[model samples]
Target: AGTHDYSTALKDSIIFFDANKCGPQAGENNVFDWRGACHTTDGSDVGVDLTGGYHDAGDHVKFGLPQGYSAAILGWSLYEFKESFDATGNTTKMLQQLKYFTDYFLKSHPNSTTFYYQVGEGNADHTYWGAPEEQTGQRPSLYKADPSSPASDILSETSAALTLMYLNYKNIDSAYATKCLNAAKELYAMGKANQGVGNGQSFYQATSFGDDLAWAATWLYTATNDSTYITDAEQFITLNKMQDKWTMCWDDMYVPAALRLAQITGKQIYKDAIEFNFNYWKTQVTTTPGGLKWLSNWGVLRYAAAESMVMLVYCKQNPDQSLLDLAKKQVDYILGDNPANMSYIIGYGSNWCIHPHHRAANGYTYADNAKPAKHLLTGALVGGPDQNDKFLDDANQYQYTEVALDYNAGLVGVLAGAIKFFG
Candidate 1:
């Protein structure tokens, strides 16, 4: 059905997770063997072992929103497409990947009210330009979620991720699964009680927390069979707290919420919302002549891939051929169907991005034409082409060259679906 190997794409996409691993790198899920032990003393101040989550993106800072939402989407990918992972011989790698992040979460959520979501100061992390092994900054700023400073968005999104881990790991590691469930319960309760998005940072600040709350509630219900979480999800839908027609990324979960609620509750309203929003995007969203569902200038393929992932998920239950085609087209475009004939993923095809905006991978110098990155961040989806389908392989163009956890998470889900459907 397609001209590419999506199973390999899925494997590479999952491999991107290893490149971003922070703190005492055992290289269990390794990338290039270039990445070694670094950031060892992460939670020294608080006396917590917050040392294992993936770094946020090209930079070392582990921002809460992207960190939580990245793991959340990746877990969802495996949840929905376990067969795809199994067929591709990536089940062991994927399991290792999930535990790597969830183990970090277990450490971060040491108590009920306190959840350490962010580590590393943005100002310092972004300023340096060298491999992760050599960068010796302490990264002093540690963000937390508590009753006094409620960050419901991070808490809830992280809750969703933890619950997914709980379900995924229940049979294999019952003790770890129980710990994840316990943490998710406490985290969800903290978010419910506090009811606000704190952490006034310009980088990845959440506009609202309602949809995230609903999203987490739904997942918790699935995991625990708790009817109260069902009601909580329903309340958010009624309050118009969730967006009916927005793309689901780090900030927005309304589309996924609607899709999930429709399945669980058999509510026509949720189905209708899902239909309208996706249909609107299929028609109204801007597209490059090469046929990318271009959303924003920043990480254009990120949104395209993310939307396609959710649409593919939607297509499973509803079987809308148009939505399926839309998702397929976008996936095809990223996999080297575009006018440039270059894969947006860092290392999938012969033609792929070498100079991704990853400081550690780039080795030295921000955008040195003479010396491009020494190592390849295999499986990373870069910030893709511009509105007119123009892309640069230079690391200086952060818009086009940057590879991130959020970006790869979405790509992983879509690639998994593509393998399931087409190959």
Candidate 2:
């Protein structure tokens, strides 16, 4: 406990963000090669530059559905914990990274009816594991069109990200903010028009799109204070009966929706629902013997960080010591408080995750094992310990060691929240 340096840890996370870029235009400090430089919508008759967004994971595939959700979650964390970011003097860095994703989302939603949800084919991208610049497969652009693809969740997630950006840039860049809000409204309409139909893609599976619909409405309401959005948000929850969600992951978003609505409305119902969801996770969900909550196997640490976000958000509103303590426990585990005694994050603590399940971090060939990855994937959070609090640092065990933008999206936010709340 000599010096946790949450501020430095938060700043290092921006390095991880930069490492995930997938476009031609390299930023000032970009050390990685600009890969996937040719992804566009020319052949699909929707001509637009759909280039920049974080790769879904270590792979080069850019799943727009999870990308949007990841951006929204990361933006929300920045919004809620701006003070913590400002403390580190990395607010500009954070916003720029968030803007990169939102700008890509804007290009994805070119019109009311056309919204590109997936950029690269998962199967194709996963076949090879190297820098995206060297990737030779055809990175096809996929979307959720009206009357054909019912991608309510994907569209809503993108719209929610736009709305969050609108709020962020409302005062600084009114024109851009207006542009974002307009796009948000248009995409929200598309989501409403095409409800209940899943993306139907194997890589990105969703249990229910209702929570996504509600999550978007909640963000829109917060941005514009529109009563219609609030009503829609509430109805989606009640009509769909989505109150049983206990954990927050890329797929399950009800907990965040309920928490945000509670903050905006200040109503007892939303607050109660938020509290109830947290209570359920604390008591009902199975956890490792060392206290890591096992919500899902794929990215168990991501779920833990995401669930911690809900706990932190609710505790911020209620200021309950017990809730704050519980939230701290989860964050502490992520920052190295588990049985492994190693930090799940790549570039933090005395002993941390050095060998993550990432193609870029592992390099291209086995001959390059003499040196660490060509580029140090600093501040990236790896998939965490197993159900029994066991961790394998091998690159092949993706379930326990893969590095993903969406995974860190929640963990970074929770770390920011913890710093801001505790300090």
Candidate 3:
């Protein structure tokens, strides 16, 4: 009542996935095709595919529900995939497209509603290893070129699979949930088998994998009532995993899925690790010259504010009212409590991205600047402004197409677990 709950907000903001508009307009669907579904622009009519359509994560794993999981994920995807795609000035056709896309996603990943995993890089099991940033202008399927980048995404997908399994546990049978349970086991095995190889612990980056694995472990523990998940989670924690370097603001939402895994799994080490990250953020809450900065740098606030909400969910299970309060501050910023902010300012553009402030139309960070001039719909470049401030780049899809599904995934992480399980 105070403000609409998350589900209601999801119901309202979730985009309609248009099937005809889902795949690339340029050519046939590539192997690593991963759609930055939701991130779109006017020029996207040429080809708005992100890395050949968001790799295998959405295709094989997230969409592998055998029964209703297909419909459910498709529903969820469609709900979050549309904003600029509907810019053709067509709503009726868009609805029709949504039905078709949902059907296709369900059909393509038939057994997904039960349990499935996408084929990408990262994790010990994956065949490739290259940081996602390395494949900057490449397609989603470019694991051959850079295999290590998708590790965190792989971990996030793993957590997603676990989260989905948990959500559908009661609705589906033991069989459905069991698939996910076993898949988690397989992932654990894979992680263990190649303990220190390429994209393994060998690489220094832990941002993506650490948090994601933490989430997967937490949920697996929740589902099976087992201690194994905790064991692995503790290793990840004790070893000291790091968060993503981009830290534009969403990691806060991105973090707790892992922490939830830790808490549920009874892994004190993992919990402590997550707590450390949170405490680090807490330090950012001090007052600036004018007011509470909340973030050391403004760019981190976007991902940070969203991520902080999810952390609050995990933190609430404990006796820390301060965590609760901190989370509220993030939400307040997102919801427009800060004099210069609003929740939906960034993270839309056909996929998992948030257009940086530099490319914005109004040149404003927190405000939507929904005006075409500020977004990829027009030729907004990251740092294409006048000279001296040439820190950003042009509006290439890779450079911009991250907000839609990726950002929404953060919201989904919160809604699916935090609001549903904890809130």
CA lDDT of 180 in candidate 2? 88
Indicate whether candidate 1 or candidate 2 has the larger lDDT.
Answer: 1
Q: What is the lDDT of residue 56 in candidate 3?
A: 21
Per model, how many backbone clashes are there?
A: 0, 0, 64
Mind giving the per-residue lDDT tens digits that candidate 3 earns over 1-423?
144244433332233121112332312331113222322221122232221122222111111111122222323232333332233233333233223333232222223222122222234323222222222221222111012223333433343443444344434356645654554455444433333211312222233344445544555666567788777765553342444222222122234444555556565655665666677666744433322333433223334434454454465466577766555554433333443332333332222123432221123222333323232212111111111111122233322322222333333333333233233
Best by TM-score: 1
Q: Write the per-residue lDDT of candidate 2 for residues 1-423, one digit (tens) a residue.
A: 433667767777776878777777534456444333433332244456667777778776777668888888888887788888888787888888888887777877766678877777777667675665566545667554565667888888888888888887777888988888899899889888868645636977777777889999998887777799888987886652335555776677877887877777788887777777777787878878988778778888888888887778776657878777777777778777888898777877758766676776667655453344555677888888888999887646768778887888887788888888875
Between candidates 2 and 3, the lDDT winner: 2
- After superposition, candidate 1 runs with Cα above 4 Å error: 238-243, 365-370
lDDT of each: 0.84, 0.75, 0.34
Lowest summed lDDT across 10 adjacent residues in model 3 is found at 379-388
What's each prediction's TM-score?
0.96, 0.92, 0.50
CA shift of 65, model 2, Å: 1.8
lDDT of 3: 0.34
Q: Tell me which residue pairs clash in candidate 1.
A: none
Name the top lDDT candidate: 1
Give the per-residue lDDT digits (tens) of candidate 1, residues 314-413.
7777778888888889998998888888988887786888778787777776456336778888888989998888888774688988888888899999
Is 1 or 3 the stronger prediction by lDDT? Answer: 1
Which candidate model has the greater TM-score, 2 or 3? 2
